[PDB]
Each structure stands twice: as C-alpha cells, then as structure tokens.
Amino acid sequence: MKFLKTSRVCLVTRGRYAGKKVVIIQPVDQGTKSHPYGHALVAGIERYPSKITRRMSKARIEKRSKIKPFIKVINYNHLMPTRYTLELEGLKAVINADTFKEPSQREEAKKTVKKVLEDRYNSGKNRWFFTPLRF
C-alpha cells in the first residue's frame, strides 16, 4: 500500500540537508519533465529549536525556540520514510513546482512554513519531529 502520501514524515539522506526531517507537501510518483523520476515537494527543519530547561529566562527561551525551515524538491531514493505523520493544515498547497522557479515565492513559503512549524512546536505535540536525529 502507498505510504509516500501527503503529511508523510521522511528523513533526507542526500544533499546539504542530510539527516534532516521533512514533511511531504506533494508527491509526484509519475514525474515531471524537469524531474523524470519519482520525487516529492517537501518542507522541513534546517535548524531545530534548542534545549530548554526549567531555570532559563523567558527571553532566552523565546530566542532558542526559533525554527529555520527549508523547502525542497527531493528524490524518493534520497528519502527514508518514517511511520510518523505530521498533519498540518497550514501546509496545504503552500508550495508547488512553480515555487522553485522564481526566488521570491520560496521566502514567503518558508515564512509560512516557519510560522506553522513554530505554532506546532509551541503546542508541545509531535516532539520527535523537532528533536534532531543523532547519527
């Protein structure tokens, strides 16, 4: 049965973002003329939120709780799927194939991804998606 669907969480295994965790925005199994292979449009975390302990100041907590996101076209061969699923309503059709063709849409898309991911992180849920993988 199909498992590279929307909201599927995967691990990037090649490229600059190797080891990072991404969520699938749009799977393209058939392929594109630019990418004649099974790929996906994904969004993920480049710089994870830092550790927070009980005695820390609120300003330092708010500084260390920041998330740096990224958006990527990625091969299925360069993804390791996870059994976890991150369902986020703000990520619905945030990026497309036309997003990566001109620069500006990438930064407002990354702003949207950053906002939604920070909201989910402040919710306290899906802690595995925000803890970095140790390898």
Binding site: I52, R54, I61, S65, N122, G124, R127
Partner: peptide, 29 residues
C-alpha cells in the same frame, strides 16, 4: 503551569548503558 517543552531524560547506570555518575571514592583514594 509548567511549560510542556520540558522533558525528562532519566539515566540508567547499569552495565553497558550510560556512563556511571561521579560517586564518593574516598574509601578507594
């Protein structure tokens, strides 16, 4: 209310698992 961003990481100091804590070794100095 406590911040949900806090989590606990207990360490088990058995053989083969995480590093033994610094104990009083004054009997063996």
């Amino acid at each position: 209310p406590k911040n949900p961003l806090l989590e606990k990481r207990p360490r088990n100091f058995g053989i083969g698992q995480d590093i033994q804590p610094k104990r009083n070794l004054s009997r063996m100095v």
